[PDB]
Amino acid sequence: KTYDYLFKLLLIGDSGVGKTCVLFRFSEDAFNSTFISTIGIDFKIRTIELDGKRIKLQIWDTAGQERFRTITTAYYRGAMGIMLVYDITNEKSFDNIRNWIRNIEEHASADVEKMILGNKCDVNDKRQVSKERGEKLALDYGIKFMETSAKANINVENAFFTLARDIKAKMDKK
Amino acid sequence: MKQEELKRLYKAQAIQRQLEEVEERQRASEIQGVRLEKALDEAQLLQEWFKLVLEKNKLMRYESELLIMAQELELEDHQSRLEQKLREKMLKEESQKDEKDLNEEQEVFTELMQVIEQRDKLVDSLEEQRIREKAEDQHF
Ligand SMILES: Nc1nc2c(ncn2[C@@H]2O[C@H](COP(=O)(O)OP(=O)(O)NP(=O)(O)O)[C@@H](O)[C@H]2O)c(=O)[nH]1
Ligand SMILES: [Mg+2]
């Protein structure tokens, strides 16, 4: 009804980095410390109005665990935006972003937009990846990066808004 | 008691409330339809009947839409059930799983994924409605 067009987005990243909680706060304004790992894949809707335009966000939430990596790969192709999520409190998550990008190249069609977020920045205390590291990596790929916190509602909005527009600009400009 | 499936049920009920309003005015619109059909200043009333055709159209768009929203929530519920059932099955160790347990665990995983599939099919068909509305309403 309300939506001019809808975009399919995808959240990928090692298990536990908070993809589900990120999607939860974006769509619901809420958070739950309880850890319940995504089984297979899920998706949620949020319609937004940027540029005077309402766009229906169909956001797919992949399971981080290798068990389902198989299945999650199936949904890379239709994706029109993808967000690679790593955990500031875990560096190994940060290093697997390369593995995720390889996955993107094997399954997502090259035109895909891309964005990287380091989440759980609400507490620096156990930070093991400096924010500077993350940004220079993103710039190495050229794609936009941001730190976020689903616990504190920091940049979740911001992030989804900007990837949503970049796909807009790219597709209407075409 | 339940927890924030609540939202799903209140919303389902609201959807059927406005559904109810809608086929209410579908009945009314249809009856004025056959009244003015019986009629055929006449120019003015033709303008009015034109308004009513527009109205039937708008009502159909809203109605088919509401029907989808309804089945969306039904699927979301079914998904919730299926998911928590699979997890309870997954807590037992693989060593303790026999063929019945393994296979039905299996079975609920696939039913689950298929339910997700149909959710998306509703998103897509909802979209074909959006684009057709754009396309024929382009003349308007
Ligand atoms: N402090 C903090 N904790 C967070 C944040 N986001 C998620 N968490 C916590 O970190 C854990 C990860 O949750 P989850 O969203 O399921 O991560 P995930 O990447 O979806 N896991 P999986 O990929 O297996 O489904 C949870 O215990 C959650 O409460 C955040 O922004 N800040
Ligand atoms: Mg998850």
Structural element, H or E, at residue A147: strand A144-147
Class at the top of the CATH hierarchy for domain A1-174? alpha beta
Tell me the torsion sign for CA atoms A61, B109, B90, B102: negative
Q: How many CB pairs under 8 A join A and B?
A: 28
Cα–Cα–Cα angle for B77, A57, B137, nearest 5°?
100
A122-137 burial code (b ≥16 CB/10 A, e <16): beeeebebeeeebbeb
A21 marked among binding-site residues: yes
Q: What are phi and psi of A43, to 5 degrees?
A: -160, 150
User: Which value in Å is the resolution of this experimental model?
Assistant: 2.8
A64 marked among binding-site residues: yes
Q: Where are the domains of chain A?
A: 1-174
Q: Determine the structural domain holding residue B86 and report its residue range.
A: 1-140
Beta strands in A39-119 (DSSP E): 41-50, 53-62, 81-87, 115-119
Domain count for chain B: 1
- Ligand 1 and A151: CB distance under 6 A: yes
Q: How far apart are CA A29 and CA B118, in angstroms?
A: 26
Strand order in the sheet with A53-62: A41-50, A53-62, A5-12, A81-87, A115-119, A144-147
Tell me if B63 sits within 8 A of B23, measured CB to CB: yes
Chain A residues closer than 8 Å to B116 by CB: 40-43
- Ligand 1 and A65: CB distance under 6 A: yes
